[PDB]
Design an enzyme around this catalytic site. Structure first.
Site, mmCIF file in Angstrom:
data_model
loop_
_atom_site.group_PDB
_atom_site.id
_atom_site.type_symbol
_atom_site.label_atom_id
_atom_site.label_comp_id
_atom_site.label_asym_id
_atom_site.label_seq_id
_atom_site.Cartn_x
_atom_site.Cartn_y
_atom_site.Cartn_z
ATOM 1 N N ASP A 85 -4.514 -4.560 -6.703
ATOM 2 C CA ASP A 85 -3.271 -3.839 -6.943
ATOM 3 C C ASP A 85 -2.520 -4.412 -8.142
ATOM 4 O OD1 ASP A 85 -0.600 -2.508 -6.307
ATOM 5 O OD2 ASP A 85 -1.872 -1.779 -4.675
ATOM 6 N N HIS B 178 4.696 -2.936 -6.165
ATOM 7 C CA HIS B 178 3.769 -2.151 -5.328
ATOM 8 C C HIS B 178 2.754 -3.048 -4.612
ATOM 9 C CE1 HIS B 178 1.262 1.555 -4.552
ATOM 10 N NE2 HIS B 178 0.262 0.720 -4.774
ATOM 11 N N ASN C 273 -2.166 10.937 -3.009
ATOM 12 C CA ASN C 273 -0.879 11.543 -2.688
ATOM 13 C C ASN C 273 -0.657 12.915 -3.321
ATOM 14 O OD1 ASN C 273 -0.257 9.064 -1.365
ATOM 15 N ND2 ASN C 273 0.517 8.198 -3.262
ATOM 16 N N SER D 286 -0.780 4.698 -0.259
ATOM 17 C CA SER D 286 -0.707 3.275 -0.610
ATOM 18 C C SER D 286 -0.165 2.388 0.536
ATOM 19 C CB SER D 286 0.201 3.108 -1.814
ATOM 20 O OG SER D 286 0.123 1.777 -2.281
#
Ligand SMILES: [Ca+2]
Length: 279
Positions: free
Chosen positions: A39, A69, A161, A224
């Site tokens: 990530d 994130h 998404n 996520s």
């Protein structure tokens, strides 16, 4: 063990019904397992990680999470307050820059890195990788995720998404890894969650409280956020001896809450990650 007033996602993963707020889990809590979070990095100094988090790799000028994130995702895997597996070891691999972007070549390199790097870590209960990222279909990206899995790592990846079929996204579309859709606290498929035959499981993804950079916390939404619930769950189940890297996705699907989610498109699995913990 019982954690009162837990984030709804944690409570959901240990419940047969929505609408509760206590997280129940075996005290072993993923001890002796490892989870790689691939990530934007992890703020390892966050009090919430208790010394159990480390950056092991970056493809950029720093290993720091300048975004948040990655730290949020890591927090859901194994932070003391916001984590599923509160005693796991967390390893950060920074394949995404501080804008949250990353070339597919760097993402692939990070996956192959973890497949080797687990041989440099102490993880007697097993190894998990959480990939809260994706883009358009790429056979190369899917192949990298398949290698990581084949090497003996439980690979969990976000469905995406786009409120779209995940067959068109990578690594989401790779059959051999665990692809994770998102749900909300009312057991609805999250409005943005991808769907499709390639999904293996759903986890909580809407309004998820976790760690953030600057030693802070925040609530955000995404597949996520669902992915690290599943990654943490796998770590926890591996320490319990219930499953292994190769079989954990199947095991989670086998033991999932079934048929409880709404707005699941025909042909998509109606399965919500569940730890089957009897306190
Ligand atoms: Ca799969």
């Amino acid at each position: 063990a019982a954690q009162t007033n837990a984030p709804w996602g944690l409570a959901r993963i240990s419940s047969t019904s929505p609408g509760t707020s206590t997280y129940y889990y075996d005290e072993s809590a993923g001890q002796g397992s490892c989870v790689y979070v691939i990530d934007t990095g992890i703020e390892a100094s966050h009090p919430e990680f208790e010394g159990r988090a480390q950056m092991v790799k970056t493809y950029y000028y720093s290993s720091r999470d300048g975004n948040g994130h990655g730290t949020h995702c890591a927090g859901t895997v194994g932070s003391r307050t916001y984590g599923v597996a509160k005693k796991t070891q967390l390893f950060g691999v920074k394949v995404l820059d501080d804008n949250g972007s990353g070339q597919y070549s760097t993402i692939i390199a990070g996956m192959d890195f973890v497949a080797s790097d687990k041989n440099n870590r102490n993880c007697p209960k097993g190894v998990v990788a959480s990939l809260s990222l994706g883009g358009g279909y790429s056979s190369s990206v899917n192949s990298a995720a398949a290698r990581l899995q084949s090497s003996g790592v439980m690979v969990a990846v976000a469905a995406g998404n786009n409120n779209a079929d995940a067959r068109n996204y990578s690594p989401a579309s790779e059959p051999s890894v665990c692809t994770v859709g998102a749900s909300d606290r009312y057991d609805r498929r999250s409005s943005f969650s991808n769907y499709g035959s390639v999904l293996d499981i759903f986890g909580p993804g809407t309004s998820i409280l976790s760690t953030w950079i600057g030693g802070s916390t925040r609530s955000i939404s995404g597949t996520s956020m669902a992915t690290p619930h599943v990654a943490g769950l796998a770590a926890y189940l591996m320490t319990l001896g219930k499953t292994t890297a190769a079989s954990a996705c199947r095991y989670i699907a086998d033991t999932a809450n079934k048929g409880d989610l709404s707005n699941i498109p025909f042909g998509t699995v109606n399965l919500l990650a569940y730890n089957n913990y009897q306190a």
